[PDB]
Design a protein around this nucleic acid. Sequence first.
DNA 1: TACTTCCTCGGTTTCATCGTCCAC
DNA 2: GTGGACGATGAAACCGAGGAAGTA
Length: 172
Amino acid sequence: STRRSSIYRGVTRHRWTGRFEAHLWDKSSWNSIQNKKGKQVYLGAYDSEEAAAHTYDLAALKYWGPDTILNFPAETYTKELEEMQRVTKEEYLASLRRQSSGFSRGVSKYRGVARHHHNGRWEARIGRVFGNKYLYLGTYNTQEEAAAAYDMAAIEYRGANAVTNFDISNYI
DNA sequence: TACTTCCTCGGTTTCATCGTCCAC
DNA sequence: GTGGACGATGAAACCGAGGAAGTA
Ligand SMILES: [N+]
């Protein structure tokens, strides 16, 4: 019936946002709500379709090695292939998500950071469906400080697989 | 067939932002 | 008055259930 939303593997143009989502099918992990093997992994949103394709390629390389099926040949990812080896799978996926277009929108380049009225300072906020709160994390003089606060709250309320503005290792 | 792998996009959650409260 | 602390709102991200697309 319908033509595929993207010419690339693992890329779906979202019907409402118009963003190119990268996603991945983990055929080895176990879906526990179902019985069967298989889990959908969301890699992020990208304003550029080619960027979502590259994101899929890199995540697939981290999951299945240099001859899994790729939108582009593994020779184009040689450098990334080495860097990939130095981190967890979760660390690498968090990094891929951190570079994505949808990670942070608006004025600040950091997620959870926006500006306190017109005071020239930066508020950090974080969302928590438990308690139905948009928690306030303070006002800071630099975006990096606000982003640090957002990060700390993020690791606290999301633990592992928490995507932070700055590297998870900064907070050990 | 039946069965696995992959895509889609609607609920759900969270952010970006701006404007409002109240304890000082 | 007022200014941190937040709440309201709309935009936009997140993400799996489910159906579509390949297998074999
Ligand atoms: N967007």
